[PDB]
Design a protein around this motif. Structure first.
Motif, short mmCIF file in Angstrom:
data_model
loop_
_atom_site.label_atom_id
_atom_site.label_comp_id
_atom_site.label_asym_id
_atom_site.label_seq_id
_atom_site.Cartn_x
_atom_site.Cartn_y
_atom_site.Cartn_z
N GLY B 26 5.88 7.40 5.42
CA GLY B 26 5.19 8.57 4.95
C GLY B 26 5.04 8.66 3.44
N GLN B 27 5.68 7.77 2.69
CA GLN B 27 5.56 7.77 1.24
C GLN B 27 4.19 7.27 0.81
OE1 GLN B 27 7.79 8.96 -1.05
NE2 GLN B 27 8.48 7.36 -2.46
N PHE B 28 3.64 7.93 -0.21
CA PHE B 28 2.46 7.41 -0.87
C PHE B 28 2.83 6.21 -1.72
CE2 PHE B 28 -0.53 7.20 -4.41
CZ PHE B 28 -1.73 7.14 -3.73
N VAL B 29 1.96 5.20 -1.71
CA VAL B 29 2.20 3.96 -2.44
C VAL B 29 0.93 3.59 -3.19
CG1 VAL B 29 3.82 3.23 -0.66
CG2 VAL B 29 1.47 2.37 -0.62
N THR B 30 1.10 2.71 -4.18
CA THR B 30 0.00 2.20 -4.98
C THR B 30 -0.16 0.71 -4.74
OG1 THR B 30 -0.80 1.84 -7.24
CG2 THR B 30 1.60 1.97 -6.93
N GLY B 31 -1.37 0.21 -4.95
CA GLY B 31 -1.68 -1.18 -4.68
C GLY B 31 -0.77 -2.14 -5.42
N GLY B 32 -0.29 -3.16 -4.72
CA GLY B 32 0.63 -4.12 -5.30
C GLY B 32 2.08 -3.72 -5.26
N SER B 33 2.41 -2.55 -4.74
CA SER B 33 3.80 -2.13 -4.66
C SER B 33 4.53 -2.90 -3.57
CB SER B 33 3.90 -0.63 -4.39
OG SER B 33 5.14 -0.31 -3.80
N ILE B 34 5.85 -2.96 -3.68
CA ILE B 34 6.67 -3.69 -2.72
C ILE B 34 7.04 -2.72 -1.61
CG2 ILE B 34 9.05 -4.48 -2.39
CD1 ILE B 34 7.62 -6.80 -3.24
N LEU B 35 7.06 -3.21 -0.37
CA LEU B 35 7.51 -2.40 0.76
C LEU B 35 8.86 -2.86 1.29
CD1 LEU B 35 5.21 -0.42 1.06
CD2 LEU B 35 4.21 -2.69 0.89
N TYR B 36 9.00 -4.16 1.58
CA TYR B 36 10.18 -4.68 2.25
C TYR B 36 10.50 -6.06 1.71
CZ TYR B 36 13.45 -5.10 6.19
OH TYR B 36 14.57 -5.23 6.98
N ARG B 37 11.67 -6.20 1.10
CA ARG B 37 12.12 -7.47 0.54
C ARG B 37 12.99 -8.24 1.53
NH1 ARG B 37 11.96 -7.73 -4.79
NH2 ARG B 37 11.69 -9.80 -5.72
N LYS B 60 -1.78 -3.69 -0.29
CA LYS B 60 -2.99 -4.13 -0.97
C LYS B 60 -3.83 -2.94 -1.44
CE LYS B 60 -3.18 -8.24 1.98
NZ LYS B 60 -4.08 -9.21 2.65
N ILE B 61 -3.80 -1.84 -0.71
CA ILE B 61 -4.60 -0.65 -1.01
C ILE B 61 -3.66 0.54 -1.12
CG2 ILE B 61 -5.09 0.09 1.35
CD1 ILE B 61 -7.74 -0.05 -1.43
N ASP B 62 -3.83 1.34 -2.16
CA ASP B 62 -2.99 2.51 -2.36
C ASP B 62 -3.20 3.51 -1.22
OD1 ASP B 62 -5.04 4.72 -3.22
OD2 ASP B 62 -5.56 2.96 -4.43
N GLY B 63 -2.10 4.04 -0.71
CA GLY B 63 -2.18 4.97 0.40
C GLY B 63 -0.81 5.34 0.92
N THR B 64 -0.74 5.59 2.23
CA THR B 64 0.49 6.00 2.89
C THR B 64 1.01 4.88 3.76
OG1 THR B 64 0.05 8.38 2.87
CG2 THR B 64 1.41 7.53 4.67
N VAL B 65 2.33 4.71 3.77
CA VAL B 65 2.98 3.64 4.52
C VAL B 65 3.35 4.16 5.90
CG1 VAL B 65 5.23 4.21 3.48
CG2 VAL B 65 4.87 1.96 4.51
N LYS B 66 3.46 3.25 6.86
CA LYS B 66 3.86 3.61 8.21
C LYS B 66 4.48 2.39 8.88
CE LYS B 66 2.97 8.02 9.01
NZ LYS B 66 1.88 8.30 8.04
N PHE B 67 5.62 2.60 9.54
CA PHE B 67 6.25 1.59 10.37
C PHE B 67 5.97 1.88 11.84
CE2 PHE B 67 9.94 0.39 7.27
CZ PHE B 67 9.02 -0.05 6.36
#
Lengths: 135, 82, 58
Positions: B26-37, B60-67
């Motif tokens: 549910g977090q907003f993210v920006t393009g190029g950000s890391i999700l899971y290392r 790749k595209i700024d938006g909202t994350v979802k698992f």
RNA sequence: UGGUGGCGAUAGCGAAGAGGUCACACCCGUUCCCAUACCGAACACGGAAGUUAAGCUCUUCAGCGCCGAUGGUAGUCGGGGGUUUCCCCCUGUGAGAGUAGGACGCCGCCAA
RNA sequence: UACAAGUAGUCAGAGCCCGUUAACGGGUGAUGGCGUGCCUUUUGUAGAAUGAACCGGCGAGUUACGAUCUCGUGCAAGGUU
RNA sequence: AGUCUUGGAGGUAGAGCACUGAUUGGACUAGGGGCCCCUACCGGGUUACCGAAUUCAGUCAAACUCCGAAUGCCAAUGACUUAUCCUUGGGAGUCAGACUGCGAGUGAUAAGAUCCGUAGUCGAAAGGGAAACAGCCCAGACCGCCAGCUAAGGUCCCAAAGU
RNA sequence: UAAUAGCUCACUGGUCGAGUGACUCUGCGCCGAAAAUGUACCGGGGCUAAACGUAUCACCGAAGCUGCGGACUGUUCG
RNA sequence: GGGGCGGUCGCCUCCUAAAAGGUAACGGAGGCGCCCAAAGGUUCCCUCAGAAUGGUUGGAAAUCAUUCGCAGAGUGUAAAGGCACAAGGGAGCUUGACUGCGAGACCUACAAGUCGAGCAGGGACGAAAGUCGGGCUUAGUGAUCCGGUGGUUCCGCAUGGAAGGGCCAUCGCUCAACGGAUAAAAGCUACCCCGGGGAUAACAGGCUUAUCUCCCCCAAGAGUCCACAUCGACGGGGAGGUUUGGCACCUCGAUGUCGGCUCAUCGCAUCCUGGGGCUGUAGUCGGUCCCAAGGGUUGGGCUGUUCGCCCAUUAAAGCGGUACG
């Protein structure tokens, strides 16, 4: 003197004891059995002495079941050494016995003699025991 | 008196790396950000999220994350544009 | 509707979680009486703390 | 009946049984495209002799596999005791291997 | 003040004595409660860890030259010797 | 920032054998001891005397997991409460920590032992209690009062309160 | 001594004639329990409840809280 | 867990690690200081290990054919994660094992480390889509200075040149004590000296009781038969704090260490004396156990020695604590 003929590691944590035994809580193979009502360790010498005290007295009457194996080794640093600087060498095998576990079971033998013989062997173990029989 | 002991030859280890998800469902993210290392394909990438050379997942595209579950057992990350 | 609050046992020695939770209700000092409206949040704090603070209705 | 998608195998694996004018598939022979680290089974090639045997498609089943809360418990957050490596009481919270049973398929869009 | 052991005080307190920068006064205090000095260094000191026999004096973070920051000033796209 | 709601990753406690090992019994037999002879045992007949492989049942694991919580953690939404958070700049001290719960290591699940995580007190906190006591319990001292109500603990005397 | 002895325990008969004999769970308790200047492991006195378990109500109990007065620092303004 | 000696010093994988991350110990297990012109890139195509059965040279396994076979087999190597829609296996082509970069983000004291879509120039592969900025992911590697070499549309002390220095590319360190003192380095001091510590050892005290001394529990047996007169296996339980010890808490601005002499004094787990049970106690003499701390409990040889052995006795020639009084 039950050696486990091989083990993955010769040293591992002493671990802890909590709650009843996971399995083997009642007699399964014999007419009657003996149960331990507190948690403790049990070692080759204990099971060997108890086994002999059982079978040598019981002679030709029947057979005795053992539900225990000292898969766990336990270490001890050499005598007269400052503690630390590496875990000590292993020199004994032990079996964890949580309360509720039935240790020994007897088959093909009269009730009273099994009763008193299990009572005899129980003194070899360091643990308060309770006689128990199949439903 | 005293007695000697030695040869533990076990006091070594790697200076361990950090492994975990650093964007919340549910977090907003920006393009190029890391999700899971991760280290190995523990969870495969979904839409709009890539797969780095070191098995890492990045948006790749700024938006909202979802698992979300992938198949019977596997998982997968995705980014849903807002 | 409106349920009033009284801090009974001193916050001294309790974990920081209980400390901050009691703080956010505005409990400056022991036996300080606080009046608050009722809702799921307030009942949350009260049932979680439940032994530093006494709750009774007006 | 074919094609092609989504859905956790509740879709699988097995055991039986039905189909084919059309569709599909086995089949027929390498003449030239292409190929067999050896080969027309396979790749492609161009037909249509005969066959539902298999594939494929439908009917049936709890043998295997799969899915699955209810009340129990074990564990445990937070409090409180005890003769305290460990036990017990209270507000919750809630294991899984076990049964109640579900299931031997459900949704599409183009060509009949 | 000669049947009581006391970091020696403080808070209660009878009795006796005196009378002040006049004020819910001064000295002494039988008896009761409480109570292991100061300093440094330490996780921790009543400490059986350290220093002081006592009194008086002396005895330790300044000045110069630069830097930087806050504050106060006079000027201000100029300021300044 | 706390709490309520929703959504996440995470493989511990627990449980379990589906994998890797350990491991107990029954059935069973391949293969080995088993002597006789024929004899190079060719094979038969050969003890349950051992005995691999399977299947029925059963017990274990920090470096086994088809499973898997409680908590903790990361966010979104709004709701109530709370008002502490971030940036720059000036000045520090701290790098000997201890004990008590709880989960572990080393140790002999010995130590007022050592080393971790977590919470508290002391450190830097007096007061009441546990006889005396830093770390145990209750509880925070801005001063005065010949006021009242209580917390732990306690009420026969020392010694306040119930023979 | 080896049967050979008042004699005894297996066993049934008669005497009066009412409670009697095994085990399971569980509260509390006893022995197991020997150290050094002196009672010395409730703090003492002492306690057979002044111990323990359960339940109820009183009271005491801190520099905690409230009461009255005063000083100061902050936020809304005296 | 005092020093010395031993061992270790950087990096990578896992457990310890308490279901985010992080988290120590002279904790528990392994590995690295490379290798690969294909073991890279791309297009295209499949599929394993083991087992049973037939087959000769040839068996337990060489090479064949069928069937079973979710992964046991592989993945350059050490563990973990992940991989059969390939990341495993095979063929053709090729060198992106590229240059200029890089929105953002992870990790972080700093230094560094890591991923990264996307843009431009040229390519490789493939018809295209589209993939390619080295290995399937994590180790296989080090500062600055100085010097060497290549390119430079830079500067070059009056001017033109040079010498020399800049910028870019790049080489020389088991500087492995691996954030690396210097290009350049081993020992003794009981002739020893100074500043500090009980932050840290030797004696004593304290905590624990592994070890040690005692006490027992079960009873196989010995005991002519009889476990329990006496002894007691194999196993279990405890008490004491006299030995060896583990810990470092007080004392290093000083607490004097063995033995002896002098003086004692305390515990009783009793060496004698007193009173009893049992005895495999005929009696004199004994063995074991119970009550018992009033008193007593010896002179010499040897050795610094306590401790021991020896001689001669006595009723006995006790064991321990008191800073090993």
């Amino acid at each position: 003197m039950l050696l486990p003929k091989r083990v993955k590691y010769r040293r591992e944590h002493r671990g802890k004891m909590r709650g009843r035994a996971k399995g083997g809580t009642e007699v399964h193979f014999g007419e009657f059995g003996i149960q331990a009502l507190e948690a403790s360790w049990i070692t080759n010498r204990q099971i060997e002495a108890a086994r002999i005290a059982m079978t040598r007295y019981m002679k030709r009457g029947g057979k005795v079941w053992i539900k225990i194996f000292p898969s766990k080794p336990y270490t001890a640093k050499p005598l007269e050494v400052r503690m630390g600087s590496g875990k000590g060498a292993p020199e004994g095998w032990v079996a964890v016995v949580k309360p509720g576990k039935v240790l020994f079971e007897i088959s093909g033998v009269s009730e009273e003699v099994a009763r008193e013989a299990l009572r005899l062997a129980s003194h070899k173990l360091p643990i308060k025991t309770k006689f128990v029989k199949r439903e | 008196s005293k007695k000697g002991v030695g040869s533990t030859k076990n006091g070594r280890d790697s200076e361990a790396k950090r492994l975990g998800a650093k964007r919340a469902d549910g977090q907003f993210v920006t393009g190029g950000s890391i999700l899971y290392r991760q280290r190995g394909t523990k969870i495969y990438p979904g839409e709009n999220v890539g797969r780095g050379g070191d098995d890492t997942l990045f948006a790749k595209i700024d938006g909202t994350v979802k698992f979300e579950r992938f198949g019977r057992d596997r998982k997968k990350v995705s980014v849903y544009p807002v | 509707a409106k349920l009033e609050i009284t801090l009974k046992r001193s916050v001294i020695g309790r974990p920081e979680d209980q400390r901050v939770t009691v703080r956010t209700l505005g409990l400056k000092k022991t036996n300080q009486t606080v009046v608050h409206e009722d809702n799921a949040a307030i009942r949350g704090m009260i049932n979680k703390v439940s032994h530093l603070v006494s709750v009774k209705e007006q």
